[PDB]
Paper text:
We determined the co-crystal structure of this photoswitchable peptiomimetic with WDR5 to understand the interaction at the atomic level. State I refers to the conditions where the cis/trans ratio of 7 was ∼5 : 95 prior to protein complexation, while in state II the cis/trans ratio of 7 was ∼80 : 20 prior to protein complexation. Furthermore, in the latter state the crystallization experiments were performed in the absence of light, and the crystal plates were always kept in the dark. In both cases, the N-terminal part of the peptide –SARA– superimposes well, and the main difference between the two structures comes from the orientation of the azobenzene rings. Remarkably, in both states the trans isomer was the one trapped in the crystal. However, from the glutamate onwards the orientation is different. The replacement of the solvent-exposed glutamic acid residue in the parent WIN peptide by the azobenzene ring provides additional stabilization through interaction with Lys259 and Tyr260 of MLL1.
It has been shown that binding of WD40-repeat protein 5 (WDR5) to arginine 3765 (R3765) of MLL1 is crucial to enzymatic activity.
Author numbering: 33 to 332
Write the structure that this text describes.
């Protein structure tokens, strides 16, 4: 592809931790160590509004599938659910006993899943703000959580070096994925069609799993990732790419099928912690840590 820098989004006063496109494609939401959520135009990069309320820094944010709600995960041990158009905090989700690290809605958006440094995964009711399940998911901080395409499954990852797949409805562990070694797993998510999971590990490696057979199918390397929980992505609006941030301040793009690096995006001045792919255009958002503080929008 030919992604080129179109906009730089400045305004967070500390490290940006996470960026996400709304499912309707109109907006970008960003979370920061500065305790704020910011909302931006997805196409023009224009600053829209700031959403505030958390008492400590925020590590993750996610949209409901109707683009009306956001959920954020905080070091203050809570998640909050926000009505984006009014800026209202609808619910505060209490129950983790350490930093909340990651969060996501299910496609129906009646459930929220969260992962924490308390080594648990929790499943919450959106309408009532109540925790429906706690899963004893891992033996170290939970780095990522994600619903599959129809909400029936959750995948979690942890510093303990495991990916686990869970049944949403019952809370039972359906699968533990483990390879030749178990370096910390720093990120995991389902592929859009639901057949694979992509997992990143702190050994500078991304891995594509066929989780039904339980086998690693592809390996992506060349980037630097030994310390941070960096988001990765399936890019599926154009060519089929894998997109990831990197601790050498670059955005990496890989050919999904052949596994070669097909583009490296330069511009950030600190670790690229988060990338997101626009749901219908060939647009990538990337965000960086404390010495950069900016979000970049790239188009192919
Ligand atoms: C090689 C040897 C030594 C080996 C054996 O011991 N050691 C290791 O494997 C190892 C060593 C150090 C390691 N330390 N890594 C970090 C250290 C400090 C930080 C500080 N935090 C940040 O810089 C940013 C702003 N926050 C984060 O990276 C994460 C959120 C990342 C994106 N979210 C997501 N992927 N779901 N959050 C945090 O680190 C803490 C919990 N929260 C915050 O910082 C909030 N204020 C803002 O996120 C992060 C990672 C990790 C592994």
């Amino acid at each position: 592809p030919n992604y080129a820098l179109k906009f730089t989004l400045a305004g967070h006063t500390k490290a940006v931790s996470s960026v996400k496109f709304s499912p309707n494609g109109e907006w970008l939401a960003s979370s920061s160590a500065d305790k704020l959520i910011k909302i931006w135009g997805a196409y023009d990069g224009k600053f829209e509004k700031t959403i505030s309320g958390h008492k400590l820094g925020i590590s993750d944010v996610a949209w409901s599938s109707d683009s009306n709600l956001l959920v954020s995960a905080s070091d203050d041990k809570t998640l909050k659910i926000w009505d984006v158009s009014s800026g209202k905090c609808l619910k505060t989700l209490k129950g983790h006993s350490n930093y909340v690290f990651c969060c996501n809605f299910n496609p129906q958006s009646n459930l929220i899943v969260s992962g924490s440094f308390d080594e648990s995964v929790r499943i919450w009711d959106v309408k009532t703000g109540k925790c429906l399940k706690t899963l004893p998911a891992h033996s170290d901080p939970v780095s990522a959580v994600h619903f599959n395409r129809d909400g029936s499954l959750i995948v979690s990852s942890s510093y303990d070096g495991l990916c686990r797949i869970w049944d949403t409805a019952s809370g039972q562990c359906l699968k533990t994925l483990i390879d030749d070694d178990n370096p910390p797993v720093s990120f995991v998510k389902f592929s859009p069609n639901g057949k694979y999971i992509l997992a990143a590990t702190l050994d500078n490696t991304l891995k594509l799993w066929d989780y039904s057979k339980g086998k690693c199918l592809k390996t992506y390397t060349g980037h630097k990732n030994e310390k941070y929980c960096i988001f990765a992505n399936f890019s599926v609006t154009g060519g089929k790419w894998i997109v990831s941030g990197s601790e050498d301040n670059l955005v990496y793009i890989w050919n999904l099928q052949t596994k070669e690096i097909v583009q490296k995006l330069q511009g950030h001045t600190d670790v690229v912690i988060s990338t997101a792919c626009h749901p219908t255009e060939n647009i990538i958002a990337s965000a960086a840590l404390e010495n950069d503080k900016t979000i970049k929008l790239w188009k192919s």
